[PDB]
Paper text:
The eukaryotic DNA clamp is [name], a trimeric ring structure that encircles and slides along double-stranded DNA to promote processive DNA synthesis. We show here that [name] has two unique locking loops that appear to tie the complex into a rigid structure, and together with a domain that plugs the DNA-binding chamber, prevent conformation changes required for DNA binding, likely explaining why [name]-[name] is exclusively a [name] unloader. We obtained four cryo-EM structures of the [name]-[name]–[name] complex (intermediates states 1–3 and 3′), in which [name] is in different configurations that affect the ring opening and closing process during [name] unloading or during dissociation of [name]-[name] from [name] after unloading.
[name]-[name] does not undergo large conformational changes in these intermediates; in particular, the conformations of the unique features (such as LL1, LL2 and the plug) of [name] in these states are the same as in the planar-[name] intermediate state 1 that was obtained from the 20-min incubation sample. In the disordered-[name] intermediate state 3, [name]-1 and [name]-2 are well resolved, but [name]-3 is disordered and invisible. By contrast, the ADP in [name] of states 3 and 3′ is stabilized by Val41, Thr85 and Arg239. Therefore, the ATPγS in [name] seems to have been either hydrolyzed to ADP or exchanged for ADP in the transition between the cracked-[name] and disordered-[name] intermediate states 2 and 3. In one scenario, the cracked-[name] intermediate 2 could occur just after the release of [name] from DNA, followed by ATP hydrolysis to yield the disordered and open intermediates 3 and 3′, which should have lower affinity to, and most easily disengage from, [name] owing to expenditure of binding energy (between [name]-[name] and [name]) used to open [name].
Residue numbers in the entry:
A (entry chain D): 36 to 363
B (entry chain E): 2 to 349
C (entry chain C): 1 to 339
D (entry chain A): 866 to 972, 1049 to 1098, 1119 to 1195, 1296 to 1418, 1451 to 1523, 1632 to 1844
E (entry chain B): 178 to 351
Write the structure that this text describes.
């Protein structure tokens, strides 16, 4: 019966979105002639690409027909590209009659919301290109992607490209306060600042985290601890303990610190991320930063391959300890 | 029915530690639209019992009965694979990591049948059936992509519970839509509390010194602590403060393997160490556990500058072990490189 | 079945008052019109005209002129009064398993001609999409009916064809065009369409298309309707490719200043231009061989960049891999400069 | 239409990065001029043998060695000597009671040896004596019941017996289940009605055409009765129903399980089920007597094949047969068929070996089993090829071909037989001179470590031909491993790669051969200096010995470096322990064995030690005292020790 | 499947030695009046790695296309990356000359050859290259690692440039 807040609290129509000016202008000029070309929305995640084009489809099509004539597909299908090829083929093959009671005849095309478009191989993008040129007039496509430079030449040369510059912290805090006051959850504003700091400009993750904290706490106060446990962020005293153990130069306390972090359930990838964020913004020498960041990259690769968190973390901490003790 | 499952708590109010988290999970259940859960933490922390408590809070007492069924799924490469399954009327429990690279052959299909049952079974209690995913950290990349598309497709149909030890291998797409429940290992005092409570309920009394020794030897594993306490109960009818806690057999075997590695560095000793590692591998001990135990028992005899190199070598060959298929090569390669480095260290 | 009315409707399909199909405007009709691969079309004529046409395996990167070429040979060999009766053109778009091999191809290959007596021909497009056992059936059909019908397999990658199918046929690779010969055609189309392009935009067009005529027409046409004039900045902004100035500034940051300032600047530029690390790595690798480095420095940079590009494929944290890319230059070239 | 395409970017004024120029530093401005001038290949002609192993000289007379073998029939004396030789090789085998039966069997040919030497009497089955004893006894009670029915019929004109109407025979392929039931039926005069997967067996078909075999008599009771009519539709003899390969179910076999259950309920004649899928005995519902054919002993089947070749006037060694049966994982039928092919072709090679424990022996069957004779000259031995150093291109190609022929099976040849082919002493398990000997030992250890690091590199960082852990997980696992083959007629339609297998096998073979050549050359160079240390008086040769198992020494070459019987026993006792009713509901599998199993073994060992000290009997009531329904032989297995 | 192999006798065939392919090639040539030279024979044997059908098809295709059997004709009608170019690239990598080796590699890349046949020809030339055993082992290991990386999906000039360099640094470093 209910629906999570991240899709149900989106902008309903165009120009209800925030911090985009040129994008809304050319989109409105597209809605004015009821002629939406092929679209390529690129930007950081949670910037509001999907909300914007869903609002555009709600402007263009009737709400009883807007769900019927759009189709949200994902490009990271592991079964190949022919699956999404035949899916869009038989989605555009059907021609179900629809009309609007407001006095405007609906445009004949359909909308495919194809997200993660930058995760496609060049051959998969070529197959998508041949599918788009096959369905040139019956459906006009959009591609949501993270980076515009991953999309190959023939697709990127024909869809209009829009960059979604990331929202600032202040507008995100204003929006999150709006969600908190409208959803009746009592959370202090420094907690909301912690939310926008933790999510790192991902407003969708911030909304999901706020909903999870609301439905996990039970209507009580959302402290920073609940947010920290929900987001999986390792607290900074553990990072400081890791760095102090590395700076001590003793292996046994380093092993004790790594074991204490492992048995607390904290993820190794999050620890690698936070160590990298600490290291790249310190007063370390350039060679120390280079060696530590290279080791962090190989440790991240090894952790993605399924290697043990304890062994990878103790090898990384041994490298950091050697780098921090070779100068002292 | 040992002490580990005879006294397993059945509801969220009977948990002894992580009581704030237990209250938070109760408040999660009472909202009526709890999301996919990603429960993680070390082994023996108490993830499975908390998931069982959540399931007993969600549905009635009927989740406490379980039944084993075998499912035979046809692979798209046309080779049928049969897997076991623990289930109830309201929930399913599966471990698709047993299917190798055909784990997606479970994932895209098995939950689909549950979804079929969600339009076949009607109970008017809740609009979903919980699918428990054990060792989801052992899935592959395409298996996790299949899981992502599966929870997108049957969101309103069934709910997902993913139990793992490490969220390092799981993809950020699979974490971006699941509520993360981190269950840390209990402290020493908490294990002592659980051991005293379990001994009192059985009618025995154990001293605080013996309970503290058991909790320290368990390495913050509650299940290992309970099993060692049961073994101590078997060994002696009364619990004395100086009663010897018996040791794990494969652990002491790994310790003599490390002693044999350290003692002599010869090709003959290398072959006997290879035979010992093969003997451990035939006992279904995981090779990552063997590597961790070997590193833990080899760092005692090492010197301070050698420790970092030995740890980095062990991590390197364990990553190779993850990448490869025949783990004895990477195990003995680490072993032989360690004997070479140790011999070079001892000559100087 | 079917999937043929769309192409037949598409061939004379244009608005003809507003649309500008630049790719379909200039198409060859016969082998004397396609001015490319002169050795290939000459030996194809030499094979056809002396009645010794073998089984052909046409492969190469797409858009090189393979399907229209073999259409020209089929039309010049067989008149329109007998074309459909003895030329069978199928592809892997119509796939219901492997039934097409034992169905239409096996029935067509095993019977004689109907109207005019001769040899028949099977066109098979995207033959790399077939399964291994489908190719194992096709090679048997080819082997036992080689005298009656000849086969022409048009594929994209030769590595997906089984060795026996490659053994039955002579292979023709349709390589990319020497970028120089493409220029005369580009001067032809700019002189026809009255557009404003500098020589630098010409260089951009020949380095983006990599010897493809259709993609060059697409990019030139799109930039023409977008701006009305084409220079390197204008085409690269419409394409959404890493600009040479941006990659040069990235290289300057990684060579000149410290770790933190370069890292912040590169992150800002990546979020600003929508730049991925993969394309940054590609363009930086191209920049490595055009910049005077020592041999050891070049070897170190190439090894490190290849490792980073492998690490990006498995789906790691892009931020940490960017830090490792900065580290690869900070290890060698910064202390070489500071010495 | 033809709308225009625009790239809208929110380019605010400023930010110092939107409008960027090439830097003015001289390092990135002096771009090196690209040159496309490569060397000209027209002037450089390719010499013969430059890219291949081509030699101008060609060998003549060394190859095309026609056998023209005319094997004389062995006299009685040399037959007795070879029988006593096999007696010496297998002391536990009863040699005398098996030879006259095979002499009667042998006393221009037109049938296979599997049916030429088919066991007509149940005692000729090799191994699995408990299983054949149970089957022979059970068919004795069923023949007794048939005779009692006949006696009751002529006179007219069962919990205590517990005579279940069916057995289910399961085991590996080719161990002799069908041969055992056929031999027992011939011994007891039954008439087999065989239903196999080679014929259409739908449920209504098998019902309406075979119920009357069970519910009624036989019209022809005397004469030609002990035959095998295979059902299809395109002394008194008792009918018997045999269901061969019940695990093979097709879509056309509609309701076959329901049909055989209806057979199970309403039969009056014995029914045999034969299968090789171990899961079927857990999948099928109903009451049946379980009979399991274990894998027979390697020495017994080796002596049986020695008997087979001795009857055909061929003399062989037991080690070659042990290698063949290890390669064929003790498949009797596969071994018999390959022995027929290899003998009737003229044997392997004519070599003389004097054994008292005479015609020339015929060793070399396992070498041509893997096709290694197609690569090597017939004067070349495999281990003699591996021991000597390799320099010339042609035998380098021979080594590469050997390793890639062994790599398509995902089998590691040089690792499995590393001790026997490295230049080091191998023995079966039952001061400046010291600095020099320790340096030599360190050199050997460094070479070994480098080689096996290279082999770990090959196993991890190189492509494998067959995708490992494709349907189960890796080796030595207990949770599954019963991946039965396909049962459906639709094709796979997969997108696998063929280039990255053919090239991958050659790459792995080349790298393995090069690494082993480097390690062996380094070890031989180190052992060249052993004479100086022997002159010095200190001998580290003992520190240089290789201690291998006795079972690994029984073969010419091994397919693996582990003990498979041990591993199968460990996985079997793990399933036996965790199939107990209380332990069926344990969620995890890794920590389940890792934590539950050693404390279970510890409790079992403590219980056994308490019972060894003559304590009270209540101490044996711990396991079932808390309701651990676990079988007793597994409890005795856990209580022994940890190896 | 395993019961089918159990009910039969399995016989194993191996790749044909270049001597045997040469003898059958001479047998076909002496019954067909085919003019030839030794370099064309070496090219035909190279283009057919252990295959007799590929050898016969390449011989017939070269005889039909040009009428004479030399190396340039064989590689014009078969269009592999030329083994002289790959041999020169490998020789440059042995001398640790990254510039000339990359010049050859980029020339091959701009000729339109795929990564797969380039790395395959690199391995095939390196198999018979005249260098030391340790250098050959390191070269084969790195070529196999790069070939696995190409097979996994990442196939760019950056990968092949990183190989040439890992091949150069094998010799330039101990
Ligand atoms: N070298 C070329 N010069 C000029 N136009 C070309 C050239 N190659 C291809 N074309 C154009 O491409 C059109 C279609 O050629 P095709 O033979 O279909 O291409 P292809 O090589 O088969 O690759 P496909 O069909 O995209 S998979 C022709 O009608 C020409 O307009
Ligand atoms: N133990 C044995 N003693 C003697 N001959 C045997 C033995 N096992 C197999 N054979 C021979 O091998 C042939 C095949 O044996 P089968 O009984 O058909 O094998 P199986 O046990 O039925 O396994 P399947 O049918 O392949 S699943 C027999 O007819 C005999 O000739
Ligand atoms: N510019 C914006 N204006 C209003 N709401 C926004 C904006 N950007 C993000 N949001 C909110 O944040 C969430 C982002 O969701 P989504 O549109 O999927 O982000 P993206 O498309 O960038 O991944 C939405 O629920 C939306 O309500
Ligand atoms: N609150 C508690 N009180 C008593 N015993 C507990 C409690 N929590 C866990 N246990 C015991 O500890 C063990 C934890 O095992 P399990 O639930 O499988 O955790 P994990 O999945 O992390 O191994 C269980 O056997 C249970 O009997
Ligand atoms: Mg084409
Ligand atoms: Mg049988």
């Amino acid at each position: 019966k209910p629906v999570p807040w991240v899709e149900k609290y989106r902008p309903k129509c165009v120009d209800e979105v925030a911090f985009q000016e040129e994008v809304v202008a050319v989109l409105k000029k597209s809605l004015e002639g009821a002629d939406l070309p092929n679209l390529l929305f690129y930007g950081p995640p949670g910037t509001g690409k999907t909300s914007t084009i869903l609002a555009a489809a709600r402007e263009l099509f009737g709400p009883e027909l807007f769900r019927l004539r759009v189709l949200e597909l994902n490009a990271s299908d592991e079964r190949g590209i022919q699956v999404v090829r035949e899916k869009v083929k038989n989605f555009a093959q059907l021609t179900v009659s629809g009309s609007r009671s407001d006095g405007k005849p609906c445009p004949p095309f359909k909308i495919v919301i194809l997200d993660e478009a930058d995760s496609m191989t060049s051959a998969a993008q070529a197959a998508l290109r041949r599918t788009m040129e096959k369905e040139s007039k019956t459906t006009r496509f959009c591609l949501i992607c993270n980076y515009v430079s991953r999309i190959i030449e023939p697709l990127t040369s024909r869809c209009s490209k829009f960059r979604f510059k990331p929202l600032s912290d202040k507008i995100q805090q204003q929006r999150l306060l709006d969600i908190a006051k409208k959803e009746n959850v009592k959370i202090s504003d420094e907690g909301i600042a912690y939310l926008v700091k933790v999510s790192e400009g991902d407003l969708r993750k911030a909304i999901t985290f706020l909903q999870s904290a609301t439905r996990l706490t039970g209507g009580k106060e959302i402290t920073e601890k609940v947010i920290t446990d929900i987001a999986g962020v390792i607290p900074a005293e553990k990072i400081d303990g890791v760095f102090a153990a590395c700076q001590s130069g003793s292996f046994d306390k380093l092993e004790a610190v790594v074991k204490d972090l492992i048995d607390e359930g904290h993820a190794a990838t999050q620890l690698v991320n936070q160590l990298h964020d600490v290291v790249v913004e310190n007063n370390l020498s350039d060679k120390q930063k280079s060696i530590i960041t290279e080791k962090l990259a190989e440790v991240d690769k090894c952790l993605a391959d399924g290697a043990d968190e304890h062994l990878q973390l103790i090898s990384l901490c041994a490298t950091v300890m050697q780098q921090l003790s070779q100068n002292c | 029915s040992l002490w580990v499952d005879k006294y397993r708590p059945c509801s969220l109010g009977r948990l002894d530690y992580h009581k704030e988290q237990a209250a938070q999970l109760r408040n999660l259940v009472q909202c009526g639209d709890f999301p996919h859960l990603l429960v993680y933490g070390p082994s023996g922390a108490g993830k499975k019992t908390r998931i069982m408590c959540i399931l007993r809070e969600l549905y009635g007492v009927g989740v406490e009965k379980l039944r084993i069924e075998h499912q035979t799924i046809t692979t798209p490469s046309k080779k049928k694979i049969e897997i076991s399954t623990i289930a109830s009327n309201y929930h399913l429990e599966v471990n698709p990591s047993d299917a190798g690279n055909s784990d997606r052959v479970v994932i895209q299909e098995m939950l689909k049948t549950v979804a079929q049952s969600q339009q076949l079974e009607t109970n008017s209690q809740r609009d979903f059936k919980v699918v428990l995913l054990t060792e989801v950290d052992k899935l592959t990349k395409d298996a996790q992509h299949a899981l992502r598309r599966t929870m997108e497709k049957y969101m309103s149909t069934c709910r997902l519970i993913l139990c793992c030890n490490s969220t390092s291998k799981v993809i950020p797409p699979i974490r971006s839509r699941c509520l993360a429940v981190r269950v840390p290992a209990p402290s020493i005092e908490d294990i002592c509390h659980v051991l005293s409570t379990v001994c009192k309920k059985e009618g025995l009394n154990l001293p605080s010194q013996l309970a503290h020794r058991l909790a320290e030897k368990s390495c913050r594993n509650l299940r290992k602590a309970l099993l060692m306490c049961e073994a101590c109960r078997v060994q002696q009818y009364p619990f004395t403060a100086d009663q010897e806690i018996p040791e794990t057999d494969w652990e002491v075997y790994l310790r003599e393997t490390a002693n044999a590695i350290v003692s002599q560095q010869t090709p003959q000793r290398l072959l006997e160490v290879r035979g010992r590692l093969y003997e451990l591998l035939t006992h279904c001990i995981p090779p990552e556990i063997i590597m961790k135990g070997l590193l833990s028992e080899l760092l005692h005899n090492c010197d301070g500058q050698l420790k970092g190199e030995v740890a980095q070598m062990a991590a390197y060959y364990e990553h190779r072990l993850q990448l490869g298929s025949k783990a004895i090569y990477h195990l003995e390669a680490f072993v032989a490189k360690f004997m070479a480095l140790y011999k070079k260290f001892m000559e100087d | 079945m079917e999937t043929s009315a769309l192409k037949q409707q598409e061939q004379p399909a244009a608005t003809k008052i507003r649309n500008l199909p630049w790719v379909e405007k200039y198409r060859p009709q016969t082998l004397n019109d396609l001015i490319s691969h002169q050795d290939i079309l000459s030996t194809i004529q030499k094979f056809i005209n002396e009645d010794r046409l073998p089984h052909l395996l046409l492969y190469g990167p797409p858009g090189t002129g393979k399907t229209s070429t073999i259409l020209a040979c089929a039309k010049q060999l067989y008149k329109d009064k007998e074309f459909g009766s003895m030329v069978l053109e199928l592809n892997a778009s119509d796939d219901r398993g492997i039934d097409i091999i034992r169905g239409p191809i096996l029935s067509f290959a095993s019977t004689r001609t109907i109207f005019k007596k001769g040899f028949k021909l099977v066109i098979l497009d995207e033959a790399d999409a077939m399964t291994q056992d489908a190719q194992n059936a096709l090679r048997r059909v080819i082997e036992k009916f080689t005298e009656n019908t000849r086969f022409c397999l048009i594929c994209n990658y030769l590595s997906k064809i089984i060795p026996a199918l490659q053994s039955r046929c002579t292979r023709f690779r349709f390589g990319p065009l020497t970028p120089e010969l493409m220029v005369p055609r580009l001067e032809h189309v700019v002189e026809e369409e009255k557009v404003d392009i500098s020589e630098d935009g010409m260089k951009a067009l020949v380095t983006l298309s990599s010897g493809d005529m259709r993609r060059a027409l697409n990019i030139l046409q799109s930039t023409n309707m977008a701006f009305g004039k084409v220079t390197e900045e204008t085409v690269y902004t419409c394409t959404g490719h890493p600009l040479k100035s941006d990659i040069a500034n990235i290289l300057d940051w990684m060579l000149n200043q410290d770790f933190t300032t370069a890292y912040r600047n590169i992150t800002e530029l990546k979020t600003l231009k929508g730049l991925a690390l993969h394309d940054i790595l590609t363009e930086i690798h191209l920049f490595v061989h055009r910049v005077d480095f020592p041999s050891s420095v070049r070897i170190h940079l190439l090894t490190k960049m290849a490792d980073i590009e492998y690490r990006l494929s498995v789906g790691t944290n892009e931020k940490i891999q960017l830090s490792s890319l900065i580290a690869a230059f900070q290890v060698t070239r910064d202390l070489i400069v500071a010495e | 239409s033809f709308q225009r395409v625009v790239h809208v970017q929110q380019k605010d004024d400023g930010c110092c990065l939107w409008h960027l120029k090439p830097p003015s530093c001289p390092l990135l401005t002096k771009f090196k001029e690209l040159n496309t001038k490569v060397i000209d290949l027209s002037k450089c002609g390719i010499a013969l043998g430059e890219f291949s192993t081509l030699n101008s000289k060609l060998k003549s007379g060394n190859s095309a060695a026609v056998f023209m073998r005319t094997r004389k029939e062995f006299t009685e004396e040399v037959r007795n000597l070879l029988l006593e030789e096999i007696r010496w090789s297998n002391p536990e085998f009863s040699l005398k009671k098996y030879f006259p039966l095979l002499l009667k069997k042998q006393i221009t040919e037109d049938m296979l040896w599997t049916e030429k030497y088919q066991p007509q009497t149940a005692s000729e089955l090799i191994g699995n004596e408990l299983a054949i004893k149970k089957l022979h006894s059970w068919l004795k009670d069923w023949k007794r019941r048939a005779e009692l029915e006949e006696r009751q019929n002529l006179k007219g004109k069962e919990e205590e017996s517990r005579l279940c109407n069916t057995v289910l025979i399961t085991g590996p392929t080719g161990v002799g289940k069908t041969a055992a039931v056929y031999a027992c039926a011939q011994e007891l005069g039954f008439k087999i009605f065989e239903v196999n997967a080679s014929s259409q067996r739908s449920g209504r078909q098998i019902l309406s055409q075979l119920k009357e075999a069970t519910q009624s008599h036989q019209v022809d009771k005397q004469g030609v009765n002990s035959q095998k009519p295979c059902f299809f539709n395109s002394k008194n003899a008792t009918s018997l129903i045999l269901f061969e390969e019940v695990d093979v179910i097709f879509d056309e076999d509609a309701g076959f399980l329901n049909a055989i259950k209806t057979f199970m309920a309403t039969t009056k004649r014995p029914v045999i089920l034969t299968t090789s899928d171990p899961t079927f005995s857990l999948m099928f519902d109903g009451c049946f007597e379980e009979i399991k054919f274990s894998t027979p002993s390697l020495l017994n089947v080796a002596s049986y094949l020695q008997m087979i070749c001795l009857t055909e006037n061929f003399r062989t060694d037991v080690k070659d047969f042990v290698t063949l049966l290890t390669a064929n994982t003790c498949d009797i039928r596969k071994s018999i068929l390959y022995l027929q092919f290899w003998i009737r072709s003229g044997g392997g090679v004519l070599e003389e070996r004097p054994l008292t424990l005479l015609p020339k022996c015929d060793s070399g069957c396992a070498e041509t089993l893997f096709g290694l004779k197609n690569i090597f000259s017939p004067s070349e031995d495999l281990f003699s090829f591996l021991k000597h150093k390799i320099t010339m291109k042609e035998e380098w190609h021979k080594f590469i071909q050997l390793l890639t022929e062994f790599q398509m099976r995902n089998v590691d040849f040089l690792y499995s037989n590393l001790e026997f082919i490295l230049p080091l002493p191998v023995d079966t398990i039952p001061t400046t001179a010291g600095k020099k000997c320790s340096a030599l030992v360190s050199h050997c250890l460094n070479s070994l470590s480098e080689f096996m690091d290279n082999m770990s590199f090959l196993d991890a960082l190189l492509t494998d031909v067959r995708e490992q852990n494709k349907y189960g997980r890796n080796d030595f696992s207990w949770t599954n491993g019963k991946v039965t083959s396909g049962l459906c007629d639709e094709f796979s339609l997969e997108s696998n790669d063929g280039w990255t297998s053919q090239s991958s096998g050659e790459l792995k073979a080349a790298a393995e051969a090069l690494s082993f050549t480097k390690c062996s050359s380094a070890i031989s160079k180190a052992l060249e200096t052993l004479n100086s240390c022997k002159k010095l008086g200190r001998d580290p040769t003992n520190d240089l010995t290789f201690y291998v198992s006795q079972k690994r020494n029984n073969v010419y070459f091994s397919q693996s470096a582990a003990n498979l019987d041990n591993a199968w026993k460990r996985i079997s006792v793990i399933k036996s322990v965790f199939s107990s009713r209380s332990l069926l509901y344990v969620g995890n599998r890794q920590a389940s064995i890792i934590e539950y199993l050693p404390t279970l073994r510890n409790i079992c060992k403590t219980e056994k030690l308490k019972e060894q000290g003559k304590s009270k009997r209540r101490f044996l009531h711990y396991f079932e005292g808390i309701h651990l329904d676990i079988p007793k032989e597994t409890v005795n297995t856990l209580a022994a020790d940890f190896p | 499947i395993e019961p089918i192999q159990s009910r039969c006798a399995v016989l194993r065939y191996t790749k044909l030695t270049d001597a045997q392919i040469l003898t059958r090639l001479m047998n076909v040539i002496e019954k067909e009046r085919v003019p030839y030279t030794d370099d064309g024979l070496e090219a035909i044997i190279f283009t057919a790695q252990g295959d007799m059908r590929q050898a016969l098809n390449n011989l017939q295709s070269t005889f039909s296309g040009f009428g004479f059997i030399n190396s340039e004709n064989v590689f014009k009608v078969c269009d592999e990356p030329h083994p002289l170019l790959v041999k020169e690239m490998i020789q440059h990598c042995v001398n640790a000359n990254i510039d000339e080796a990359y010049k050859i590699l980029a020339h091959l890349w701009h000729l339109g050859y795929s990564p797969e046949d380039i790395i395959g020809n690199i391995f095939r030339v390196c198999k018979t290259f005249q260098m030391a055993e340790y250098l050959k082992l390191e070269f084969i290991k790195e070529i196999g690692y790069t070939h696995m990386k190409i097979a996994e999906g990442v196939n760019s000039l950056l990968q092949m440039a990183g190989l040439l360099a890992r091949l150069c640094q094998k010799t330039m470093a101990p």
